[PDB]
Each structure stands twice: as structure tokens, then as C-alpha cells.
Paper text:
With the exception of α-hemolysin, which is homo-heptameric, leukotoxins are bipartite toxins, formed by the non-covalent association of two distinct proteins, a class S and a class F component of approximately 31 and 34 kDa, respectively, into a likely octameric species. Panton-Valentine leukocidin (PVL) is associated with necrotizing skin infections, such as boils, and plays an important role in the poor prognosis of necrotizing pneumonia. Two additional structural domains are also found: the rim domain anchors the protein to the membrane surface, while the stem domain, closely apposed to the core β-sandwich in the soluble form, contributes two β-strands to the pore β-barrel. Since the binding of LukS-PV to the membrane is a saturable process, the necessary presence of a LukS-PV receptor on the cell surface was thus proposed. This was recently confirmed by Spaan et al. who showed that the C5a receptor is required for the binding of LukS-PV to human neutrophils.
The mutants exhibiting significantly decreased binding abilities with respect to wild-type LukS-PV were: R73A, Y184A, T244A, H245A, and Y250A, with Ki values ranging from 1.8 to 6.2 nM, i.e. a 69- to 238-fold increase compared to the Ki value of wild-type LukS-PV. Four LukS-PV mutants (R73A, Y184A, T244A, and Y250) displayed significant alterations for all measured parameters, i.e. at least 50-fold decrease in affinity for hPMN membranes, 2-fold decrease in the slope of Ca2+ influx and 2- to 10-fold reduction in pore-forming capacity. The T244A, Y246A and N248A mutated proteins crystallized in identical conditions (50% PEG 200, 0.1 M MES-NaOH, pH 7.50). The corresponding crystals belonged to the P43212 space group, with similar cell parameters (a = b∼94 Å and c∼308 Å) and 4 molecules per asymmetric unit. In the case of the rim domain, wild-type LukS-PV and mutants T244A, Y246A and N248A displayed only small differences, with r.m.s. deviations comprised between 0.20 Å and 0.30 Å, whereas the structure of the rim domain of the Y184A and Y250A mutants were markedly different, with r.m.s. deviations of 1.10 Å and 1.28 Å, respectively, when compared to the wild-type LukS-PV structure. Three of the four most sensitive residues (Y184, T244 and Y250) are found in this region, at close distance from each other. Indeed, three of the five most sensitive residues identified (T244, H245 and Y250) are located in this loop and form a surface that could represent the principal binding site for the receptor.
Numbering used by the authors: 2 to 121, 125 to 243, 247 to 284
The structure:
Amino acid sequence: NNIENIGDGAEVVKRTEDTSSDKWGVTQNIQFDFVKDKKYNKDALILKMQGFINSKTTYYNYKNTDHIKAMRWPFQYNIGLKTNDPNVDLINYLPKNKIDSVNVSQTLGYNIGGNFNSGPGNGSFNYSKTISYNQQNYISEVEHQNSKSVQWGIKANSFITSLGKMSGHDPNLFVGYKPYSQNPRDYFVPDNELPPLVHSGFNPSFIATVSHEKGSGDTSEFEITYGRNMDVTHATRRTGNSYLEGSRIHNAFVNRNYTVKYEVNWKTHEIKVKGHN
């Protein structure tokens, strides 16, 4: 049913965990793929990190003013995986390098004997998992890594505005066309002109493989963190005719994260949520 035979003397035990937080506006859909291979000297678990991180983009009036209005938006999305267990090792993860393409689609391949690789286009190994996500206008890069952790940043990068090409740091990024409006939303460009990561949110698709030493302990725990770093753009009406000017508070609210702690059983191939925030 949920055990797939992959080669001669090898199989994959597939488990799934789903957890949403109205507190953080995050859904975490984790796939745990246990590699049971006679020709491989270690226990191996492939984690596919998916779900949704709501952009939580809000538009509000600045204080008791009628002419200064603000937009709070996600400058960067946070994706992280850590283990406390001393017997566990982070052996790979996808994406490995800084990547600016609109759609990030990569493939991790496995071959009997503990051989892991990356797919070209399509390849045929014993087992494989594919990552697939869109990051229009954003850039993906590894912020931190060691044998126990991996942290990705999906940050605002390059945008084609009316005033030409803009960086993610441009203070006029997202300033609108309606200075006389009384609605904070009107002070900023419409959804049609916004990237999905700003108007809606992020659908992560990340992979990490962990190796456990056989018989060093039945259970292991991993913490998976999904979040966002929020910027504040203040649009002020300048007065011939009237226009709007933007000013930025960069990293106004950092580490708005949803962290879930999962417990894994190497013998029974069972999953438990230990806790969360």
C-alpha cells in the first residue's frame, strides 16, 4: 500500500504529516520517505517539505493621517530543517545553489548501495523525488547549513515596474497610482501587477535527505520551520499634480515562523508530531 519495492533487496516506506497554524498562516505538508536497503550501511530518510506560507500582505492607514498609507509585505520566506540527534546527518538537500529562475524544478535520485544524485530531461534510478515551486521576482539561496541543519531564504530580487527595472530594496517598489484615494490599497499597485508571493503567498517544495546510524536508537526528531520576514512600505502623497512616494522599513518583522517538531521511528516507520508553536 504505502511500501514501494524499488530494487532487489530494497524498498521505500512512505509516510505523511499535515499541520496548519492559523496563528502564523502556514500549512506544513511533510512527506517522510524511509529507505530500507540491504546494500546500504545506514538508515536513510528523504524529507519533502511542502505546504503553504500565507504572504499576510496587509494595507493600512498610517496613524490619523489621510495622506500616508502603508503596505506590509513578505520580503523573504523562511524554510528550515534541523535535528538535535547526534547520530543523524544531513547528507543532501535541494536546491543546493543560488537560483533566480521563475520556476525551481529539480530531482533527487537514489540508487541501491546508498548512491544519491541529481536528475537531468529525465533519468531512471531506483527511487526519486521531485521538487517544484514558483518564485516569480524572488531568489532562492542557502542561508545556513551543517550536518544537523539547512536554512533557505526566498527573498525579493528583481521587478519590472512602470519606472523601469527595480531591485527588492527599491523604496518605491509597489507604490501606486491613486494619491487622492482614501483606501490604503489604492496607494499601491494592483494584484495584477504584484507577484504571487506578495498577493497570495508561497508554496514551498524543498528536499533534504538524512542518514541515521543503524541501531544507534529507534527514534529521532526534526524541527521544520516555515515563515516570513516582513517589510513596511509607507506611501506618502506629494503635491502641479499629485503623486505617491515610497519609504521602506526593511525587515520590520523578522522570523514570523511556524515551527513543528516531528518524531520518527526507524524500526516501525511511524511519525508523530511532538509539538509546535
